Design a protein around this ligand. Structure first.
Ligand SMILES: Nc1nc2c(ncn2[C@@H]2O[C@H](COP(=O)(O)OP(=O)(O)O)[C@@H](O)[C@H]2O)c(=O)[nH]1
Ligand SMILES: [Mg+2]
Length: 173
Protein backbone atom coordinates (compact mmCIF):
# COMPACT_ATOMS: atom_id res chain seq x y z
CA UNK A 1 0.00 0.00 0.00
CA UNK A 2 1.47 3.30 -1.11
CA UNK A 3 1.33 6.23 1.28
CA UNK A 4 1.89 9.16 -1.03
CA UNK A 5 1.91 12.76 0.22
CA UNK A 6 0.64 14.90 -2.68
CA UNK A 7 1.73 18.48 -3.27
CA UNK A 8 0.15 20.59 -6.03
CA UNK A 9 2.03 23.59 -7.49
CA UNK A 10 -0.22 26.33 -8.82
CA UNK A 11 0.50 29.75 -10.34
CA UNK A 12 0.34 31.78 -13.52
CA UNK A 13 2.29 30.88 -16.63
CA UNK A 14 5.93 31.90 -16.45
CA UNK A 15 6.33 32.33 -12.68
CA UNK A 16 8.78 29.39 -12.37
CA UNK A 17 6.56 26.47 -11.21
CA UNK A 18 8.40 23.98 -13.41
CA UNK A 19 11.80 25.46 -12.58
CA UNK A 20 11.10 25.17 -8.81
CA UNK A 21 9.89 21.57 -9.06
CA UNK A 22 12.77 20.44 -11.39
CA UNK A 23 15.41 22.24 -9.27
CA UNK A 24 14.10 20.44 -6.18
CA UNK A 25 13.48 16.93 -7.57
CA UNK A 26 16.23 16.67 -10.21
CA UNK A 27 18.65 19.54 -9.56
CA UNK A 28 18.02 20.67 -13.14
CA UNK A 29 16.55 23.47 -15.23
CA UNK A 30 13.27 23.81 -17.11
CA UNK A 31 14.11 23.35 -20.81
CA UNK A 32 12.08 26.01 -22.63
CA UNK A 33 11.44 23.70 -25.62
CA UNK A 34 9.93 20.69 -23.78
CA UNK A 35 6.10 20.52 -24.21
CA UNK A 36 4.02 22.33 -21.59
CA UNK A 37 1.85 19.63 -20.00
CA UNK A 38 1.12 18.60 -16.43
CA UNK A 39 3.58 16.14 -14.85
CA UNK A 40 3.93 14.57 -11.45
CA UNK A 41 7.32 13.88 -9.93
CA UNK A 42 8.17 11.37 -7.24
CA UNK A 43 10.64 11.78 -4.38
CA UNK A 44 11.17 9.27 -1.55
CA UNK A 45 11.03 10.98 1.87
CA UNK A 46 10.86 9.97 5.53
CA UNK A 47 7.36 9.65 6.98
CA UNK A 48 6.13 8.44 10.40
CA UNK A 49 9.24 6.35 11.21
CA UNK A 50 9.21 4.85 7.69
CA UNK A 51 9.24 6.08 4.12
CA UNK A 52 6.73 7.47 1.73
CA UNK A 53 6.64 9.04 -1.71
CA UNK A 54 6.31 12.74 -2.07
CA UNK A 55 4.29 13.36 -5.28
CA UNK A 56 4.69 16.84 -6.71
CA UNK A 57 2.27 17.93 -9.45
CA UNK A 58 3.61 20.65 -11.73
CA UNK A 59 0.40 22.17 -13.15
CA UNK A 60 0.05 24.17 -16.40
CA UNK A 61 -1.28 27.23 -14.60
CA UNK A 62 -3.77 29.27 -16.60
CA UNK A 63 -3.83 26.57 -19.26
CA UNK A 64 -5.25 24.09 -16.74
CA UNK A 65 -8.91 23.35 -17.41
CA UNK A 66 -10.93 24.48 -14.35
CA UNK A 67 -12.50 20.99 -13.75
CA UNK A 68 -8.91 19.66 -13.64
CA UNK A 69 -7.93 22.31 -11.11
CA UNK A 70 -10.83 21.12 -8.88
CA UNK A 71 -9.73 17.46 -9.22
CA UNK A 72 -6.13 18.45 -8.41
CA UNK A 73 -7.19 20.15 -5.18
CA UNK A 74 -9.43 17.26 -4.18
CA UNK A 75 -6.56 14.79 -4.74
CA UNK A 76 -3.96 17.13 -3.17
CA UNK A 77 -2.81 17.28 0.48
CA UNK A 78 -0.76 20.48 0.31
CA UNK A 79 -0.46 23.45 -1.98
CA UNK A 80 2.28 25.73 -3.28
CA UNK A 81 0.97 28.95 -4.80
CA UNK A 82 3.74 30.49 -6.85
CA UNK A 83 3.93 34.05 -8.12
CA UNK A 84 6.83 36.03 -9.61
CA UNK A 85 8.10 39.02 -7.61
CA UNK A 86 8.45 40.79 -10.98
CA UNK A 87 4.68 40.47 -11.73
CA UNK A 88 1.93 41.88 -9.53
CA UNK A 89 -0.56 40.40 -12.02
CA UNK A 90 0.81 36.93 -11.21
CA UNK A 91 0.06 37.44 -7.52
CA UNK A 92 -3.48 38.64 -8.32
CA UNK A 93 -4.02 35.55 -10.48
CA UNK A 94 -3.70 33.33 -7.38
CA UNK A 95 -7.01 34.67 -5.94
CA UNK A 96 -9.36 32.17 -7.61
CA UNK A 97 -7.29 29.07 -6.83
CA UNK A 98 -6.76 30.08 -3.20
CA UNK A 99 -10.53 30.53 -2.85
CA UNK A 100 -11.21 27.11 -4.40
CA UNK A 101 -8.59 25.44 -2.17
CA UNK A 102 -10.13 26.90 1.00
CA UNK A 103 -13.62 26.04 -0.10
CA UNK A 104 -12.83 22.43 -1.03
CA UNK A 105 -10.62 21.69 2.03
CA UNK A 106 -12.95 23.63 4.36
CA UNK A 107 -10.27 25.92 5.85
CA UNK A 108 -6.72 27.14 5.10
CA UNK A 109 -5.88 26.10 8.65
CA UNK A 110 -6.44 22.39 7.89
CA UNK A 111 -3.88 21.86 5.10
CA UNK A 112 -0.48 23.24 4.27
CA UNK A 113 -0.60 26.24 1.93
CA UNK A 114 2.56 28.13 1.00
CA UNK A 115 2.67 31.41 -0.92
CA UNK A 116 5.96 31.54 -2.89
CA UNK A 117 7.52 34.65 -4.35
CA UNK A 118 9.81 33.18 -6.98
CA UNK A 119 12.52 34.93 -9.03
CA UNK A 120 13.84 36.76 -5.99
CA UNK A 121 17.20 37.02 -7.83
CA UNK A 122 15.55 39.80 -9.85
CA UNK A 123 16.09 43.42 -8.84
CA UNK A 124 13.13 44.96 -10.75
CA UNK A 125 10.27 43.83 -8.52
CA UNK A 126 6.56 44.63 -8.69
CA UNK A 127 5.74 42.99 -5.33
CA UNK A 128 7.85 43.88 -2.28
CA UNK A 129 8.70 41.19 0.30
CA UNK A 130 6.66 43.09 2.91
CA UNK A 131 3.67 43.19 0.58
CA UNK A 132 3.78 39.43 0.04
CA UNK A 133 4.14 38.88 3.78
CA UNK A 134 0.91 40.87 4.32
CA UNK A 135 -0.91 38.75 1.71
CA UNK A 136 0.13 35.58 3.52
CA UNK A 137 -0.80 37.04 6.94
CA UNK A 138 -4.29 37.93 5.56
CA UNK A 139 -4.66 34.56 3.88
CA UNK A 140 -3.44 32.75 7.06
CA UNK A 141 -0.82 30.85 5.06
CA UNK A 142 2.95 30.53 4.96
CA UNK A 143 5.23 32.60 2.80
CA UNK A 144 8.72 32.18 1.39
CA UNK A 145 10.79 33.84 -1.33
CA UNK A 146 12.71 31.64 -3.72
CA UNK A 147 15.03 31.72 -6.70
CA UNK A 148 14.82 28.46 -8.68
CA UNK A 149 17.67 29.81 -10.77
CA UNK A 150 20.00 30.18 -7.82
CA UNK A 151 18.67 27.15 -5.83
CA UNK A 152 17.75 29.65 -3.14
CA UNK A 153 15.14 28.40 -0.63
CA UNK A 154 14.20 25.55 -2.99
CA UNK A 155 14.91 22.61 -0.58
CA UNK A 156 13.76 24.83 2.28
CA UNK A 157 10.33 25.38 0.63
CA UNK A 158 9.56 21.69 0.51
CA UNK A 159 10.96 21.09 3.98
CA UNK A 160 8.83 23.88 5.50
CA UNK A 161 5.77 22.67 3.58
CA UNK A 162 6.21 19.15 4.99
CA UNK A 163 6.70 20.51 8.50
CA UNK A 164 3.35 22.35 8.26
CA UNK A 165 1.52 19.00 7.96
CA UNK A 166 0.52 18.00 11.46
CA UNK A 167 -1.06 14.57 10.60
CA UNK A 168 2.23 13.05 9.52
CA UNK A 169 5.79 13.57 10.57
CA UNK A 170 7.73 14.02 7.31
CA UNK A 171 11.29 15.04 6.45
CA UNK A 172 13.51 15.19 3.39
CA UNK A 173 16.47 13.48 5.15
N1 LIG B 1 15.38 35.17 -12.94
C1 LIG B 1 14.71 34.01 -12.74
N2 LIG B 1 14.07 33.43 -13.77
C2 LIG B 1 13.40 32.25 -13.55
C3 LIG B 1 13.39 31.63 -12.23
N3 LIG B 1 12.64 30.50 -12.31
C4 LIG B 1 12.23 30.40 -13.59
N4 LIG B 1 12.68 31.44 -14.31
C5 LIG B 1 12.44 31.66 -15.73
O1 LIG B 1 11.10 32.03 -15.93
C6 LIG B 1 10.65 31.39 -17.13
C7 LIG B 1 9.48 30.49 -16.79
O2 LIG B 1 9.91 29.44 -15.95
P1 LIG B 1 8.99 28.14 -15.86
O3 LIG B 1 9.62 27.23 -14.85
O4 LIG B 1 8.78 27.49 -17.22
O5 LIG B 1 7.61 28.72 -15.28
P2 LIG B 1 6.15 28.00 -15.29
O6 LIG B 1 5.49 28.49 -16.56
O7 LIG B 1 5.53 28.67 -14.06
O8 LIG B 1 6.28 26.50 -15.21
C8 LIG B 1 11.81 30.63 -17.72
O9 LIG B 1 12.50 31.50 -18.62
C9 LIG B 1 12.69 30.38 -16.54
O10 LIG B 1 14.05 30.24 -16.93
C10 LIG B 1 14.11 32.36 -11.16
O11 LIG B 1 14.16 31.95 -9.99
N5 LIG B 1 14.73 33.49 -11.50
MG1 LIG C 1 5.77 24.96 -16.41
Amino acid sequence: QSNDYRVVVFGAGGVGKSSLVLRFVKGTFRDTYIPTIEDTYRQVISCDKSVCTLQITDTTGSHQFPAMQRLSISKGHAFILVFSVTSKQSLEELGPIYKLIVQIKGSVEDIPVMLVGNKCDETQREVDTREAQAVAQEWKCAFMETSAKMNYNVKELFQELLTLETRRNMSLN
